[PDB]
């Protein structure tokens, strides 16, 4: 805001979102269309983390699935694997167990709505990372988790879409990089 004004850190032009405060981790203040105003921030935070935690595993997997396949499973481009496993019924097994865990999760969301638990804490810290000795680290880690999650969700999105246009696997695209098919060759007119 070249003219002086009170304003949000991430975007100079817009005012700091109301009810958006530094307290949730990773708050650069960017909620340009308030969603936080329409729905509670804690319910939204639970979503950012859940999507992210799902995404972070997915980014690793799409890359790992390209390089390696468990021997019992066939090696196919990952998007194809979902079709193979869905016929196999492997995906139903992932769906059933993930749903069971989610039902416990849905109860915890209801508690998050009624005070009680902080968004996204399932108290899953089997290892001692951020243990009471390491309790200082939790604030820092929280920031990393949102940041890794925000990035992963963008990255997976990218890997899958880029892969559809290129028809080229992400590791392969890196090492051999080509324009979307036909562009060097094609003339629009």
């Amino acid at each position: 805001a070249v003219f002086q004004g009170d304003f949000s850190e991430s975007v100079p032009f817009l005012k700091t979102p109301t009810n958006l405060d530094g307290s949730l981790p990773g708050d650069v203040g960017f909620d340009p269309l308030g969603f936080s105003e329409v729905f509670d921030i804690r319910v939204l935070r639970e979503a950012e983390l859940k999507h992210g935690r799902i995404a972070m595993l997915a980014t690793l997997g799409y890359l790992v699935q390209e390089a390696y396949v468990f021997p019992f499973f066939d090696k196919v481009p990952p998007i194809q694997a979902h079709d193979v496993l869905v016929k196999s019924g492997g995906m139903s097994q992932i769906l059933l167990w993930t749903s069971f865990l989610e039902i416990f999760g849905g109860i915890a969301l209801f508690q998050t709505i009624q005070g009680r638990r902080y968004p996204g804490d399932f108290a899953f810290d089997p290892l001692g990372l951020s243990q009471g000795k390491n309790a200082e680290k939790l604030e820092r880690y929280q920031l990393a988790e949102i940041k890794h999650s925000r990035l992963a969700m963008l990255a997976f999105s990218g890997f899958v879409h880029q892969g559809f246009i290129t028809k080229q696997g992400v590791l392969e695209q890196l090492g051999n990089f080509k324009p979307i098919p036909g562009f060097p060759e094609a003339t629009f007119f």
């Binding site: 070249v2 002086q4 032009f13 817009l14 005012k15 003339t187 629009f188």
Partner: protein
Amino acid sequence: GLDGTYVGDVGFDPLGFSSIIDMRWLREAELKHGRVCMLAATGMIVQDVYQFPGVTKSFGDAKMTTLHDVAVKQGSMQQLLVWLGLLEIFGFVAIVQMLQGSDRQPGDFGFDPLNCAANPDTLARRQLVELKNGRLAMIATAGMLHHFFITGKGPIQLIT
């Protein structure tokens, strides 16, 4: 409805647009059209003089509007719509925040990378320049395109 405070006010609103529409909107619009037209005019003139490295082969000689009809097939135009649209959604938030009471003045996105407006006085002179060049640019762009429609010729070519 027209008062001295807006920069560039010579008092010219014959059709009384100011009376029906918030000036803040009208101004944000005049600058936005102007900023786009200035770039458009520059581009149309640049395009005739130079082209990026592989461009001529894919598009050939099409220029001005014809290039757009050819460009859309490349998808160069789409990338431009998607990215420009993403900037615009923030721009819609900006107009909304400004229309809701807010600090931002119409047309201010906070882009001053070289700190050119740091002096308060110099900024005012620059603001008048920006509306005036922009008002000219829009007139020019329209002219170049109409000239194109009728002559089928790029503006530098028409001069040639």
